[PDB]
Amino acid sequence: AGRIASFLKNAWAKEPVLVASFAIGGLAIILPSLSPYTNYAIRINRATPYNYPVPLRDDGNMPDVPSHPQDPQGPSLEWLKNL
Amino acid sequence: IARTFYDGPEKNYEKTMAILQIEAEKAELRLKELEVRRLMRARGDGPWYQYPTIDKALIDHSPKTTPDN
Numbered sequence: 001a002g003r004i005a006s007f008l009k010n011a012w013a014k015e016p017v018l019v020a021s022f023a024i025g026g027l028a029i030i031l032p033s034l035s036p037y038t039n040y041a042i043r044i045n046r047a048t049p050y051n052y053p054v055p056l057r058d059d060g061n062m063p064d065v066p067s068h069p070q071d072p073q074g075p076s077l078e079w080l081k082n083l
Numbered sequence: 084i085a086r087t088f089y090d091g092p093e094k095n096y097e098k099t100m101a102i103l104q105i106e107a108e109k110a111e112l113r114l115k116e117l118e119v120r121r122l123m124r125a126r127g128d129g130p131w132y133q134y135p136t137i138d139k140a141l142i143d144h145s146p147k148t149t150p151d152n
């Protein structure tokens with residue numbers, strides 16, 4: 001507790017560049033795992049339609065697939081507009 | 084001497100018969116195995132000499148961004 005205190009004191013006095021570098025690196029490593037928005041970034045990446053959405057052949061047993069884009073079934077991007 | 088140190092001729096006789104049967108079976112088995120190896124290496128239909136091909140489980144059967152694969 002007091003060993004590391006004087007150690008960080010001497011480091012801030014002699015090598016502030018290395019101190020700032022290790023602080024920034026450690027923050028970059030640990031902060032992304034505590035964030036509620038990392039999942040938002042994954043979802044944003046998943047919602048980007050790079051290729052054509054190929055339709056499915058209706059067999060009468062697909063209650064949760066839309067038959068027109070403006071039908072209520074399927075994924076919604078409403079969460080994204082309010083983001 | 085014959086009573087104390089040796090046996091009758093039938094023992095050696097029939098032991099020889101057993102030995103001969105074992106050896107002749109081993110000989111025909113060796114020849115048959117050579118023939119089976121020749122056929123399995125030439126035809127590739129046997130369990131032996133199976134050379135790997137590509138696992139069909141690696142193929143991706145999903146729509147491929149263009150209709151003609």
Ligand SMILES: CCCCCCCCCCCCCCCCC[C@@H](O)O[C@H](CO[C@H](O)CCCCCCCCCCCCCCC)COP(=O)(O)OCC[N+](C)(C)C
Nearest residue numbers: 084085086087088089090091092093094095096097098099
């Ligand atoms: C009567 C007087 C005039 C005639 C003399 C006759 C001469 C005969 C004596 C010579 C001895 C023969 C030489 C031994 C060779 C035989 C070895 C072997 O074949 O014998 C085994 C049998 O073992 C015998 O005991 C042989 C042992 C002989 C060892 C000789 C050692 C002598 C050294 C002398 C030391 C004396 C004291 C020293 C003082 C310092 C057989 O094994 P086994 O699994 O049964 O086979 C199955 C047969 N069955 C079914 C009948 C049982």
Ligand SMILES: CCCCCCCC/C=C\CCCCCCCC(=O)O[C@H](COC(=O)CCCCCCC/C=C/CCCCCCCC)COP(=O)(O)OCCN
Nearest residue numbers: 008010011014015018019020021022023024025026027029
């Ligand atoms: C977990 C984070 C990892 C990712 C971030 C880091 C990425 C890049 C930064 C690291 C680059 C490599 C650093 C190499 C270290 C070299 C050490 C060294 O030998 O240099 C010392 C100088 O540095 C030292 O004193 C040795 C180490 C002392 C401590 C240095 C920093 C250690 C960590 C400090 C901060 C701890 C974490 C941050 C907390 C901030 C407070 C909230 C000697 O200086 P000279 O150039 O030889 O001088 C010649 C003339 N006399």
